[PDB]
């Protein structure tokens, strides 16, 4: 191993870039993983004074899938300075008018409530489409496993697996459906 | 407050814990039986 | 590729008592040692699961079987 003092330190205290993807996945687990990677918790030398972190890039933020009926229940409200500015926008409307805000607020609330929150948020980037700048693309390294497993529709199981699955009952031969 | 009240008095923490732990636990059928197996004589005579 | 509760349980289920300070120091300055410890923990977990499933008869886990004392 060896490694001189200054180079070894610069290597062990280096900033790595990661990549995350949505596409039919929940935003809670994605935001939790992003916060865990930004705060440096994933590393064995985690500490606030050390200022250890890693950039997190999320793509396809428009294809996020919520569980239950949160699309018409989660209200992302925010009061302004002037009176009567109590805005109570739902999740669907907030996503239609701004598809890069749900995961942003999730990661903002997940991260600790200290002055490092703004820095950790600035370290994070978001993109609502597959298009990513060349700089960030070249900066990306490795790809951690995805959270959800995707249910897989009927148009992907292939005919082989469909035929392998046996039937379960026998409808009448003269059933009008 | 008095012992008896018109409303439902909030039980103590230990009291509520004992009431919850001493709840009723019905049996658990491993298979459930739901998924297991005069004038007519006069009519016949007529 | 492991969790803290299961790892600690598997480490305790092998007569290998090690405090948290030494574990962290090894994980920081000895990745291979922590990798071997995690492998041993996963092996102990699998052995315990197999035992609980089949009640042994008669392997009793090659890594299990604590050393008795007197």
């Amino acid at each position: 191993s060896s490694f001189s003092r200054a180079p070894q330190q610069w290597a062990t205290f280096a900033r790595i870039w990661y990549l995350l993807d949505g596409k039919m996945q929940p935003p809670g687990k994605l935001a939790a993983m992003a916060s865990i990677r930004l705060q440096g918790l994933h590393k064995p030398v985690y500490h606030a004074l050390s200022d250890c972190g890693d950039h997190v890039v999320i793509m396809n933020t428009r294809h996020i899938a919520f569980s239950g009926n949160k699309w018409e229940q989660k209200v992302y409200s925010s009061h302004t300075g002037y009176p009567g500015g109590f805005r109570q926008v739902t999740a669907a409307q907030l996503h239609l008018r701004d598809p890069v805000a749900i995961v942003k607020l999730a990661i903002y609330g997940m991260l600790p409530k200290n002055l490092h929150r703004r820095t950790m948020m600035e370290r994070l980037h978001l993109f609502p489409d597959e298009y990513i700048p060349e700089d960030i693309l070249k900066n990306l390294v490795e790809e951690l496993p995805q959270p959800r497993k995707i249910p897989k529709r009927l148009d992907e199981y292939t005919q082989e697996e469909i035929d392998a699955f046996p039937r379960l009952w026998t409808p009448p031969e003269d059933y009008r459906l | 407050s008095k012992a008896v009240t018109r409303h439902r008095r909030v039980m103590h923490f230990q009291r509520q814990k004992l009431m919850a732990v001493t709840e009723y636990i019905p049996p658990k059928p491993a298979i459930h039986p739901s998924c297991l197996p005069g004038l007519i004589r006069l009519l016949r005579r007529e | 590729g492991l969790k803290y509760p299961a790892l600690i349980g598997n480490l305790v289920k092998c007569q290998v008592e090690l405090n948290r300070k030494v574990l962290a120091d090894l994980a920081i300055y000895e990745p291979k040692t922590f990798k071997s410890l995690a492998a041993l923990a996963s092996r102990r977990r699998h052995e315990g699961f197999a035992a609980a499933l089949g009640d042994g008869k008669e392997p009793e886990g090659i890594f299990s079987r604590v050393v008795q004392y007197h």
Binding site: - | - | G1, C14, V16, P31, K32, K35, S36, A38, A39, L40, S42, R43, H46, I62, F63, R65, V67
Partner: protein, 43 residues
């Protein structure tokens, strides 16, 4: 053939045990970076 962890990074995994069963032994040889798992230095 059994492997508790994938031996494809850092080092391999080989848990051993002594005849007396009182001390555990291991053998974690470092893994070498293959030749086809790199890129040419651009210029």
């Amino acid at each position: 053939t059994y492997s508790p962890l994938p031996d494809d990074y850092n080092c391999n995994v080989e848990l051993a045990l002594t005849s007396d069963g009182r001390t555990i032994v291991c053998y974690h040889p470092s893994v070498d970076i293959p030749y086809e798992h790199t890129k040419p230095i651009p210029r």
